[PDB]
Design a protein around this nucleic acid. Structure first.
Ligand SMILES: [Mg+2]
Ligand SMILES: [Mg+2]
Ligand SMILES: [Mg+2]
Ligand SMILES: [Mg+2]
Ligand SMILES: [Mg+2]
Ligand SMILES: [Mg+2]
Ligand SMILES: [Mg+2]
Ligand SMILES: [Mg+2]
Ligand SMILES: [Mg+2]
Ligand SMILES: [Mg+2]
Ligand SMILES: [Mg+2]
Ligand SMILES: [Mg+2]
Ligand SMILES: [Mg+2]
Ligand SMILES: [Mg+2]
Ligand SMILES: [Mg+2]
Ligand SMILES: [Mg+2]
Ligand SMILES: [Mg+2]
Ligand SMILES: [Mg+2]
Ligand SMILES: [Mg+2]
Ligand SMILES: [Mg+2]
Ligand SMILES: [Mg+2]
Ligand SMILES: [Mg+2]
Ligand SMILES: [Mg+2]
Ligand SMILES: [Mg+2]
Ligand SMILES: [Mg+2]
Ligand SMILES: [Mg+2]
Ligand SMILES: [Mg+2]
Ligand SMILES: [Mg+2]
Ligand SMILES: [Mg+2]
Ligand SMILES: [Mg+2]
Ligand SMILES: [Mg+2]
Ligand SMILES: [Mg+2]
Ligand SMILES: [Mg+2]
Ligand SMILES: [Mg+2]
Ligand SMILES: [Mg+2]
Lengths: 122, 206, 98, 75, 240, 244
RNA sequence: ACCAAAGCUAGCUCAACAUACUAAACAAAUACAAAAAUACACCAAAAUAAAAUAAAACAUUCACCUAACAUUAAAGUAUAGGAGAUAGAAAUUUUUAUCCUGACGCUAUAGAGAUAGUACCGUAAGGGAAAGAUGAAAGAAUAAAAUAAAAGUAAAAAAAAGCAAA
RNA sequence: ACGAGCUACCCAUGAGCAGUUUAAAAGAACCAACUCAUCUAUGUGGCAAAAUAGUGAGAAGACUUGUAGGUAGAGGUGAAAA
RNA sequence: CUCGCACACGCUUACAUCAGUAACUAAUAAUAUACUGAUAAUUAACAACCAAUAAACCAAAACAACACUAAAACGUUUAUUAA
């Protein structure tokens, strides 16, 4: 009989079995049967300029490392918002109702790169 | 990368993925299990690079420097003390280079020696008032410094020259992170001036 | 409604345990089917002056068919509960006194 | 979401991105996130099999510890 | 699995529609009728048995149509006829002497005087003479022609009483219906259908008749010449 | 090996642990209690002790309920607590004769019933027993509000009871918007079944429905940690200000 | 002298306690023809256990037979039974908290089927194995010691006559 | 529970039949491809758990055949051979 | 002596280059498409996925002129929307 442990790929079936190998789609089917490719569906690699970049894939061997201190939400908040909140509270202009001026986003549906829905691949 | 080993694996002073170990034990072998006394990481006081003395064997009372330790079989090996002689250069019609290799030894046969009186002592772990855990001898009552040993890579930080593809120490240790509330994507877009006005539509998740 | 009785006796269980039922306890005998009995007669208090039965304010005994299909659905009569009977009794009292 | 498939297991079903709501989806509507009454028996077998595996692992470890203590009487 | 019927076509069309035969099997897939299957491919020509169907409600009176062609229908024994009136054409059941270019009248009017019964015309049963040969008889008003349809077969009007018509079917049974039921006059086409001779066992297979089973069954008490009396009149009128 | 807990207590332990423990206490106790349903297909005997005719001795005798199978379509109507009796019987009523599988079924009727509180006509399938119970209770509303769950044995009946209780407790003007006097008269005669709102919306709910309702009530979006950190920082700043 | 033989371990079994019970992995893809990112729906279903057997046959009956109330007694008693085989209570009584948990269980034809539900056998449901042995060190194989003890052969074919022996 | 990928019968969708004699595509005739399997001889742990060689019957039809679907055992299907 | 080339279905690297074959596969050797190891390979134009909604439309394929019966798969156009 046929195998069962082997993977069921597109090479193991008839002509009518044309299964994808995992690549993402890049368009749809047009009018006369051709494939219409959508430009926005094709990823655009945002590659920076490395001409003046003074860093290398390897570090110096004598360079010391540091104690592992993974970044947490508490540390990020202390670094980005705690000084501003403290200064505003000392000044007396602090407004608990409005926090959008401090980087807080009440709703993610407005901006481009959303965090919980994860609108961006990488 | 790491190699996987069967539970019925015997350690023979050879790298598990090495050709010699592969030829000694093929992937289809499962030998009898040897009894190994359970010694924890907090009670293993025999390190690599320290001077030790030999209790029993042909070289009774001789002292040597530890060169390797195998925690799986509780083995400690010293350089050129407990030795058997073997030929390494073997050909069809020539032989030579008969070198003395050395057999492993157990923790019950090897005990640490303090550098003060050079006499055998028993090592017990103690907690210092400075927050450090250093081995303290009991026969004499002195601390034994950690035997710093060179790593297997073979390079010492004191003499290192940067290649074309190595960062300088100042560049590697330079701090340029500004902890704001923007994603890497948003920061890169702002830095490179990529302007995007239109936004995503409603997407249902289920 | 069919009423059935077990052919075999079930062993006792007095501590509150469920009786140990067996396959032989699934054998039943139809002692009586209630649909074949002479059905009782429904008593209703009239609320309107009906031609066939009588005047509003009387307890009349009509069969369940007409009681459930004609008197009650159309509001021509009500049940003979004590609460409903007290209201008719007081209505009769005031009608007699005035 | 923590779902319960037809095999009785508790899985973490990740959500996929769709252009139409869940009640209008041909492919999603025929999926089943619930267990039929005939799955409790197999769930019980799974529980008992895992319990047996854990119990015999514990017994093996206890026997190994006792054998090591007998072989090395350093006490 | 369960199969779906081929008869999913809500729009009436003149062109023949392709049909999927099923030999005795029900929707489940098991045989319910034996001796059916392996015939010739056929296309179904939809027949409008409601002869009096005015094109628009604005003119619900009698109307005249013209016969375009009388053609062969594989799905029935009789020949069909294409009749065109206004902006639509319909397949009807051809009578004994329908030809191309003929004129047919479809009416729903009943008068005190009987109408001269033509062959292709369709009139209500209350307007036809007492001794008229009819076909495509309709049971309830506005229901359709379920009764006599086979080639050459025709019923005979017997008597009209109390606004109610009585007919005699080809099975010699009396059928009582309302006098307003529309029925076509005359014998159905292909009057020589009973005299056809199947030349060989292969023509039956062409028609789609599988051979009978070879199992020998002893006759029971059902067999024998049962001289039974004619069944009583089948009445469709609703007496209050 | 052996389970620590017998398999019989698995359901009770599952009800005790998890979201099932967050259900209201009255609902939990209402499902925990198990009242015996009234005898319908079998005739009970009065005394607990009876004299054996052949032995002439007093012996204890008890009631063994006859298993009744309720088909799924019984939950869409009011069958009066009766259903299908699945059992065996002896042909010719002789023990030594054959044993035959037998199914006894109730006679179903399609009747329209009026609800005074809900002001609606329901076309439901009922039995002569249901109609007789309605007659004895002197009203469809009274019958529904009086007969408990174990005697109704209908999810539709439980839903009707829940709706009636909710309407009575809310004093809804939807009954007779233009007849306040009629509405008050209707509501006053059912005053014996007034239930507080905290318990009147959990009477005709199954376990799955109750779990879904509790999950919907407890469903809250996770508040961002920015709010927690801001509150903590404000508290620390207030403490520092007050300590100086 | 070949073939061969012997290890003592991997692990299993039965109970007690027990948190209170579908382990870890779940980046992406997974009930399209599973592991195939992406389009206007349809979803759900219940209806008694039967028989092999015992009654030396077999028709009424036939303990347990995947539904909790445990233990000491009442008691194999009252009862139910082609009153046969057999089935069988109840009223009423007894039961003092925890550790003291390991083994007059097996040692590779045994103990789990398990080195594994894997190879292999079937279209599928499904069935389902056998296989390990040196040494402190093989980073001691011009490698060292114990048995050379089964059947089968060789060393070493046979010389009238006979259940092969006495 | 699992089985109509073999086979029995249907449902869709396709495909084959060259030459000769006949106003013929006539369930006509000769005979190929093709489909069956009459008789004999080998084979009988075989090439083969049903074959080889020769010889035979049909070969425009109630014909052969590819793909896919359906009918499931107290049944299916059957030009009845249980 | 002559069952060859390709496609469909099916198997999945058994295909190609180099090297080795004491032994393992060929029912034996030689060596190798059938064993062993290393390294490479099948590149789309051919094939698969590749519009709906209403209306006009009875008129067979068999060189199809025109017919027989067993009545026969196979299509365009118009209008509205087709990223
Ligand atoms: Mg297989
Ligand atoms: Mg393929
Ligand atoms: Mg292919
Ligand atoms: Mg393209
Ligand atoms: Mg037909
Ligand atoms: Mg015809
Ligand atoms: Mg016949
Ligand atoms: Mg016959
Ligand atoms: Mg017997
Ligand atoms: Mg016997
Ligand atoms: Mg017998
Ligand atoms: Mg017998
Ligand atoms: Mg039994
Ligand atoms: Mg008796
Ligand atoms: Mg007897
Ligand atoms: Mg008791
Ligand atoms: Mg074993
Ligand atoms: Mg021997
Ligand atoms: Mg002799
Ligand atoms: Mg099939
Ligand atoms: Mg088939
Ligand atoms: Mg020819
Ligand atoms: Mg011929
Ligand atoms: Mg032959
Ligand atoms: Mg010859
Ligand atoms: Mg031939
Ligand atoms: Mg011939
Ligand atoms: Mg012939
Ligand atoms: Mg039988
Ligand atoms: Mg049969
Ligand atoms: Mg016969
Ligand atoms: Mg026979
Ligand atoms: Mg193969
Ligand atoms: Mg190769
Ligand atoms: Mg060879």
């Amino acid at each position: 009989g046929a195998d069962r442990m082997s993977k069921w790929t597109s090479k193991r079936g008839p002509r009518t079995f044309c299964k994808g190998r995992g690549a993402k789609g890049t368009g749809f089917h047009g009018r006369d049967g051709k494939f219409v490719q959508i430009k926005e569906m094709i990823p655009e690699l945002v590659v920076p300029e490395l001409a003046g970049f003074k860093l290398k894939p390897y570090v110096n061997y004598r360079a010391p490392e540091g104690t592992d201190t993974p970044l947490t939400a508490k540390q990020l908040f202390l670094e980005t918002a705690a000084p501003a909140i403290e200064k505003d509270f000392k000044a007396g202009t602090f407004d608990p109702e409005h926090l959008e001026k401090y980087g807080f986003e009440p709703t993610q549906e407005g901006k481009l790169f959303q965090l919980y829905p994860k609108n961006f691949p990488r | 990368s790491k190699v996987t080993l069967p539970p019925n694996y015997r350690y023979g002073m050879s790298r598990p993925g090495s050709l010699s170990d592969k030829r000694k034990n093929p992937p289809g072998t499962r030998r009898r299990r040897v009894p190994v006394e359970p010694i924890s990481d907090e009670d293993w006081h025999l390190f690599c690079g320290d001077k030790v003395e030999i209790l029993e064997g042909k070289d009774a009372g001789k002292q040597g420097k530890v060169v390797q330790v195998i925690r799986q079989r509780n083995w400690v090996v010293v350089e050129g003390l407990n030795t058997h002689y073997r030929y390494v250069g073997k050909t069809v019609d020539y032989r030579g280079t008969m070198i003395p290799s050395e057999a492993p030894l157990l923790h019950n046969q090897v005990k640490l020696v303090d550098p003060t009186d050079r006499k055998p002592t028993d090592v017990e772990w103690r907690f210092t008032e400075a927050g450090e855990r250093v081995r303290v001898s009991t026969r004499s009552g002195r601390i034994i410094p950690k035997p710093e040993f060179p790593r297997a890579d073979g390079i010492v930080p004191e003499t290192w020259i940067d290649g074309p593809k190595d960062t300088s120490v100042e560049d590697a240790l330079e701090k340029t992170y500004v902890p704001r509330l923007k994603t890497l994507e948003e920061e890169v877009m702002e830095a490179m001036g990529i302007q995007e006005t239109r936004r995503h539509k409603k997407v249902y998740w289920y | 409604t069919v009423i059935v009785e077990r052919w075999w006796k079930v062993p006792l269980a007095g501590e509150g345990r469920k009786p140990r039922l067996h396959r032989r306890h699934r054998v039943y005998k139809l002692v009586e089917d209630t649909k074949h009995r002479p059905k009782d007669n429904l008593e209703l208090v009239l609320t309107q002056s009906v031609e066939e039965l009588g005047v509003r304010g009387d307890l009349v005994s009509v069969k369940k068919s007409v009681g459930r299909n004609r008197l009650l659905p159309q509001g021509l009569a009500v049940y003979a509960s004590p609460e409903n009977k007290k209201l008719f009794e007081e209505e009769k009292l005031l009608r007699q006194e005035g | 979401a923590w779902r319960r498939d037809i095999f009785g297991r508790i899985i973490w079903h990740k959500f996929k991105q769709w252009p139409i709501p869940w009640y209008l989806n041909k492919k999603y509507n025929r999926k089943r996130f619930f267990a039929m009454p005939y799955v409790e028996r197999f769930v019980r077998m799974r529980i008992e099999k895992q319990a047996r595996i854990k119990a015999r692992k514990r017994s093996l470890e206890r026997k190994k510890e006792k054998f090591l203590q007998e072989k090395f009487p350093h006490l | 699995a369960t199969s779906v019927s081929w008869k999913s076509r809500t729009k009436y069309t003149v062109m023949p529609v392709k049909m999927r035969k099923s030999g005795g099997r029900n929707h489940t897939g098991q045989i319910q009728v034996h001796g059916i299957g392996g015939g010739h491919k056929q296309r179904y020509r939809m027949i409008d048995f409601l002869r009096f169907r005015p094109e628009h409600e604005s003119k619900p009176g009698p109307f005249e149509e013209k016969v375009i062609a009388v053609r062969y229908d594989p799905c029935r024994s009789a020949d069909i006829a294409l009749v065109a009136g206004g902006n639509r054409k319909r397949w009807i059941i051809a009578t004994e002497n329908m030809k191309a270019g003929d004129t047919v009248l479809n009416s729903d009017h009943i008068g005190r005087m009987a109408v001269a019964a033509r062959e292709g015309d369709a009139h209500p049963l209350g307007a036809l003479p007492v001794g008229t040969l009819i076909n495509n008889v309709e049971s309830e008003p506005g229901r359709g022609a379920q009764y006599i349809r086979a080639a050459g077969t025709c019923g005979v009007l017997l008597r009209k009483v109390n606004g109610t018509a009585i007919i005699q079917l080809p099975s010699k049974r009396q059928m009582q219906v309302l006098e307003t039921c529309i029925a076509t006059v005359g014998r159905v086409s292909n009057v020589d259908h009973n005299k056809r001779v199947i030349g060989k066992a292969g023509r039956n297979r062409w028609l789609g008749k599988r051979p009978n089973s070879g199992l020998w069954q002893r006759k029971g008490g059902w067999a024998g010449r049962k001289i039974r009396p004619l069944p009583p009149m089948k009445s469709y009128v609703k007496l209050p | 090996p052996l389970h620590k807990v017998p398999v019989g207590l698995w359901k009770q332990l599952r009800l005790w642990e998890g979201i099932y423990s967050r259900l209201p206490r009255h609902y939990l106790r209402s499902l925990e209690e198990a009242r015996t349903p009234t005898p319908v297909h079998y005739r009970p005997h009065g005394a607990k002790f009876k004299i054996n005719p052949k032995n002439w001795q007093r012996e204890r005798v008890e009631d063994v309920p006859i298993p009744v199978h309720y088909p799924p379509e019984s939950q869409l109507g009011l069958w009066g607590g009766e259903g299908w009796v699945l059992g065996h019987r002896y042909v010719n009523n002789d023990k030594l004769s054959k044993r035959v599988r037998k199914v006894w079924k109730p006679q179903l009727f399609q009747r329209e019933l009026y609800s005074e509180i809900l002001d609606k006509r329901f076309t439901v399938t009922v039995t002569m027993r249901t109609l007789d119970l309605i007659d004895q209770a002197c009203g469809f509303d009274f019958y529904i509000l009086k007969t408990p769950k174990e005697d109704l044995c209908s999810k539709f009946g439980m839903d009707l009871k829940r709706g009636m209780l909710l309407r009575l407790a809310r004093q809804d003007p939807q009954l007779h918007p233009d007849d306040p006097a009629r509405r008050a008269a209707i509501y006053d005669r059912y005053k014996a079944f007034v239930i507080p709102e905290a318990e009147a919306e959990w009477v005709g709910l199954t376990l799955d429905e109750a779990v879904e309702k509790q999950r919907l009530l407890e469903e809250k979006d996770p508040i961002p940690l920015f709010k927690i950190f801001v509150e903590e920082l404000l508290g620390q700043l207030q403490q520092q200000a007050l300590s100086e």
